[PDB]
């Protein structure tokens, strides 16, 4: 039993809710919140920009030190950093960004990072400003993640379509 509330149950391990991931994380304080990161951990917009704003830019400061030490992530890769005031940990995961011409096949690799964590609050990878079809992203999530994932979909209109079209 966990403290995630109000989710629709898509599968054995995947749950979905129309919610702002920022407001969700502040309420639940999960062990892990997933950020929709880019390889530079530049959290300018989308989910990343919003999560960073909620940390008062502490996420960006930590991220800049991480990059200065380690260099950029790989597309499809991840790193574990602090969750600041939102969660114990933040798993920064880089899905392919279609608006940059990145290979959508790397989306499965991106979701594989979730399997290293027993429970996660997460967005749909490569959705929103990363330009991929959120229906496809949900499909890959369900077919790749085996740990317990609580998906937050910000757009209510998108949330209803994801449920109504889920096979």
Q: Can you give the binding site for ligand A1BBI, defined by CB under 6 A?
A: 20-22, 46-47, 50, 123-124, 127-128, 134, 152-155, 158
Of the pair 69, 157, the CB lying nearest ligand A1BBI is at: 157
Of the pair 119, 135, the CB lying nearest ligand A1BBI is at: 135
For helices 58-70 and 46-54, angle between their N-to-C axes, nearest 10 degrees: 120
Least distance from ligand A1BBI to the Cβ atom of residue 128, Å: 2
Least distance from ligand A1BBI to the Cβ atom of residue 69, Å: 28
Of the pair 1, 126, the CB lying nearest ligand A1BBI is at: 126
Of the pair 73, 121, the CB lying nearest ligand A1BBI is at: 121
Q: How many whole angstroms separate alpha carbon 45 and alpha carbon 107?
A: 20
Residue showing the smallest CB distance to ligand A1BBI in the complex: 128
Give Cβ neighbours of residue 164 (< 8 Å, ≥ 6 apart): none
Q: Can you read off the two tokens belonging to residue 9?
A: 């149950």
Query: Residue-wise over 67-106: b if at least 16 C-beta within 10 A, else e?
Result: eeeeeebebbbbbebebbebbebbbbbbbbbbeeebebeb
């Amino acid at each position: 039993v966990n403290s995630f509330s109000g989710y629709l149950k898509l599968t054995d391990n995947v749950y979905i809710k129309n919610a702002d991931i920022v407001e969700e994380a502040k309420k639940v304080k999960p062990t892990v919140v997933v950020n929709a990161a880019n390889v530079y951990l530049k959290h300018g917009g989308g989910v990343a920009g919003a999560l960073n704003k909620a940390t008062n830019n502490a996420m960006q400061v930590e991220s800049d030190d991480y990059i200065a030490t380690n260099g950029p992530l790989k597309v499809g890769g991840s790193c574990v950093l602090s969750g600041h005031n939102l969660a114990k940990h933040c798993l920064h995961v880089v899905g392919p960004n279609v608006n940059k011409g990145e290979d959508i096949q790397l989306l499965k690799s991106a979701y594989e990072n979730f399997n290293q964590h027993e429970v996660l609050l997460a967005p749909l990878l490569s959705a929103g400003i990363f330009g991929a079809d959120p229906i496809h992203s949900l499909r890959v999530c369900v077919d790749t993640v085996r740990t317990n994932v609580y998906l937050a979909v910000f757009d209510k209109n998108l949330y209803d379509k994801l449920v109504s079209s889920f096979l």
